[PDB]
């Protein structure tokens, strides 16, 4: 069971960060979205366009998947995204990320009915 | 089991114009630090000072806790803190917070051996 001391640190301590930082985004979001549990996910992209716009990519340009499947689609336009990459100093359970604001085309794998994004393949 | 569609949304979607804005700090932090599971915690303070300074409060000014417990202590000096409070529009599971950076004295309950902060009581 989590100690009261540890609970206080979790709920109330942020000694290592500035709340006015723009570059702490990946650190917080990777944590929030449960990609720092068990291991640090090394690479992850967050997309800031509307869910409708991202879903629409499944009806856009068919392209090669990095994994050779035939269900990938590239956005017709660039999208506002954030690239999160694990830093060289990052070591689980202290997962540290470089945040990069980018505007690139996204490539997603689509699946299901309706066909919706199920995997983020690449930004190009 | 989490659907592939939902997994993509969790991992890759953060729709909005200013995702890295300091105004979003509480939204991100409250999520990361596990205070938005089950319900939105309505009020929470993060402290940006060294843990040494926060621990030192346990040897500072004795004050009664808001709840009538008698193990609270007020910081002798102000501390840089971030006040997180639910907005009028916040509704679980979509928790939304107003982020306010302030400098205030903190009041914490101290417990255990060694006696360390175990609860955040108030800021004044
Ligand atoms: N720009 C990129 C490139 C790859 N990735 C991917 O990095 C991981 C491996 O390729 C993928 O996660 P999962 O495969 O764990 O879902 C994720 O889709 C990403 O999120 N952004
Ligand atoms: N300024 C304030 C006032 C209260 N709080 C507190 O709001 C809650 C109840 O007062 C406390 O959480 P828990 O009691 O759930 O740990 C938390 O310490 C805070 O974090 N900041």
Among positive and negative, which fits the CA dihedral B44, A35, A97, B9?
A: negative
Q: Using CA atoms, how far apart are residues B1 and A100, in angstroms rounded to an integer?
A: 32
Buried b (16+ CB within 10 A) or exposed e, A43-77: ebbbbbbeeeebbebbebeeeebeeeeebbbbbee
Nearest CA to B95 out of B18, B32, B6 is that of B32
Q: Using CA atoms, how far apart are residues A59 and A52, in angstroms rounded to an integer?
A: 12
> Do B47 and A11 make contact, defined as CB atoms within 8 angstroms?
no
DSSP B13: B
For residue B29, CA distances in Å to A25, B44, B82 come to 10, 10, 11
Q: For chain A, give the longest Cα–Cα distance.
A: 53
Q: Using CA atoms, how far apart are residues A83 and B117, in angstroms rounded to an integer?
A: 36
Q: Using CA atoms, how far apart are residues B5 and B20, in angstroms rounded to an integer?
A: 24
Q: Please state whether beta strands B79-86 and A61-63 pair in parallel, antiparallel, or not at all (unpaired).
A: unpaired
Instruction: Check if A119 has its Cβ closer than 6 Å to any atom of ligand 1.
Output: yes
Backbone torsions φ then ψ of A79, nearest 5 degrees = -130, 150
Are B78 and B105 a contacting pair, CB within 8 Å? yes
Contacts of A29 in chain B (CB under 8 A): 14, 19, 28, 32
CA A117 to chain centre: 14
DSSP B87: -
Q: What kind of experiment solved this structure?
A: X-ray
Which of B10, B17, B45 is the closest to A34 by Cβ?
Answer: B10
Q: What's this structure's resolution in Å?
A: 1.6
Give the strands of the sheet with A72-74, arranged side by side: A61-63, A72-74, A106-111, A116-123
The burial class, CB within 10 Å (0-12 / 13-18 / 19+), for B113 is: exposed
DSSP A57: G
Are A82 and B16 a contacting pair, CB within 8 Å? no
Are A27 and A81 a contacting pair, CB within 8 Å? no
DSSP string, B41-86: -SEEEEE-S-HHHHHHGGGSEEE--TTS-S-EEE-SS-EEEEEEEE
**Domain annotation for chain B: domains and CATH numbers:** 1-124 (3.10.130.10)
Nearest CA to B27 out of B120, B100, B98 is that of B98
Q: Using CA atoms, how far apart are residues B36 and B93, in angstroms rounded to an integer?
A: 8
Backbone torsions φ then ψ of A109, nearest 5 degrees = -90, 140
């Amino acid at each position: 069971k989590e100690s009261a001391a540890a609970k206080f640190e979790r709920q109330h301590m942020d000694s290592g960060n500035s709340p006015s930082s723009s570059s702490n985004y990946c650190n917080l979001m990777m944590c929030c979205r449960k990609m720092t549990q068990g291991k640090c996910k090394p690479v992850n992209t967050f997309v800031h366009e509307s869910l409708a716009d991202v879903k629409a990519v499944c009806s856009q340009k068919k392209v090669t998947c990095k994994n050779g499947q035939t269900n990938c689609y590239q956005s017709k336009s660039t999208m506002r995204i954030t690239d999160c990459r694990e830093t060289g100093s990052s070591k689980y359970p202290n997962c540290a990320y470089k945040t990069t604001q980018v505007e690139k085309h996204i490539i997603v794998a689509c699946g299901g009915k309706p066909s919706v994004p199920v995997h983020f393949d690449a930004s190009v």
